[PDB]
Amino acid sequence: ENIEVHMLNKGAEGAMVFEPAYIKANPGDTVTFIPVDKGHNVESIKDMIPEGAEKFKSKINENYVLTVTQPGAYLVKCTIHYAMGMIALIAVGDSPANLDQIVSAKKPKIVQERLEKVIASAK
Ligand SMILES: [Cu+2]
């Protein structure tokens, strides 16, 4: 199945957000990122995707279809607005083995707070 995600300048959680910011998917699903506001992209974060997965980076303002195969958790960002907290978490399959590692990893304090809300007030 397909899961559609919007990239927005402003949303429920504030400025520069992905909606939804928590995405549950199964191997073989697709995640479609739609730039409803311009100035955004999607890129996988170094060491914050499962082992075996390839990294990716889309073009600014492009509609991007991501096919997820390897199970685990994926933290993705908007390259442009990562420092302002623009991130989304994709969880592929149940009990993603690297999720605690991702939560502990080093990242901007604004992104850390949003990530904690996605796993709490999101799952
Ligand atoms: Cu952005």
Swiss-Prot record:
Binding locations of Cu cation: 40, 78, 81, 86
Q: What are the subcellular locations of this protein?
A: Periplasm
Any one cellular-component term (Gene Ontology): periplasmic space
For this UniProt record, the keywords arranged alphabetically read as follows: Copper, Electron transport, Metal-binding, Periplasm, Signal, Transport
Cofactor annotation comment:
Binds 1 copper ion per subunit.
Q: What does the record give under GO molecular function?
A: copper ion binding; electron transfer activity
The species this protein belongs to is: Alcaligenes faecalis
| Cofactor(s) essential for the protein | Cu cation
What switches on expression, per the entry, is described as: Under anaerobic growth conditions and by nitrite.
- Its domain of life reads Bacteria
Where would I find the Plastocyanin-like domain in this sequence? 5-93
KW Transport (keyword) present: yes
Q: What is this protein called?
A: Pseudoazurin
Q: What does this protein do?
A: This soluble electron transfer copper protein is required for the inactivation of copper-containing nitrite reductase in the presence of oxygen. Serves as a direct electron donor to the nitrite reductase.
